[PDB]
Design a protein around this ligand. Sequence first.
Ligand code: 88A
Length: 291
Amino acid sequence: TQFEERHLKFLQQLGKGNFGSVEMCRYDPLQDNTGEVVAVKKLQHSTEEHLRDFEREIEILKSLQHDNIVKYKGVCYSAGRRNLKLIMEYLPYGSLRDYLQKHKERIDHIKLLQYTSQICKGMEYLGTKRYIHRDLATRNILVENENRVKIGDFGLTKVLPQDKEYYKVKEPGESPIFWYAPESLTESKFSVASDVWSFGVVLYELFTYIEKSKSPPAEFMRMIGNDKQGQMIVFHLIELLKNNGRLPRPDGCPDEIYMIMTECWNNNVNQRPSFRDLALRVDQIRDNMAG
Ligand SMILES: CS(=O)(=O)c1ccc(-c2cccn3nc(Nc4ccc(N5CCOCC5)cc4)nc23)cc1
């Protein structure tokens, strides 16, 4: 689980998010083109604040072993702590967001529910470790193959305090406000329940097939009125959600699946379903579609 920098060969950028960046690299210590391809995450700009966060993120990933969670391989200190790299398994199909968009004709509703189910199982497992993901979105879900997705990034994930069911955090800069629960917007409270709200948005995303005009940002902005910007956007979002304004049912989405989304989007934190009950309900719907 210790990787030397000089044996890591850059191939491609895979994405930036929050304050990290991920690259596809070949780890080739024999320098004979026989090493495996791996995903390598690093800080966009190394900083003491971010490095301490990055180290916690690494310990979180390292602590997680689950079919629907991306695998930790090691760390590359090599160029010093300030050039800390996280080495993970490379998943060849990319983000679910991108995959779905590219293969919309091939992916039916039965298949979307398989992915949904797998995402719920990953999240239930996180929950057993009292980890709050804080950034559930299709851009952070990865595709290993046609039958398996994994939660693939943990940049914003926090551990609950021992004595509370929520964690208050406010990081500098841009937050994915259109995936956030109301209490995360108004009070900065994150919880398993806020992750369930976001899971609702993931389910919406999936059933929209990532159609551009249908993304959560684009829908909420239209509902808010596109004649608004800056620090008044979150103010109007809070008001819209407080008055039970919600993302519409996607085109073709069955009502029983939309019901799941709307129940995740309860203003009452305590009435949102559990991840185990979501898996249950999704698997029943899956079966009734199987027949
Ligand atoms: C949300 S992000 O962009 O910060 C990000 C990107 C990648 C990862 C990541 C973490 C751990 C393992 N993997 N494997 C892949 N694979 C992968 C493969 C292809 C593509 N793309 C398809 C070709 O177009 C560009 C991206 C993206 C990711 N990506 C990862 C985590 C977060």
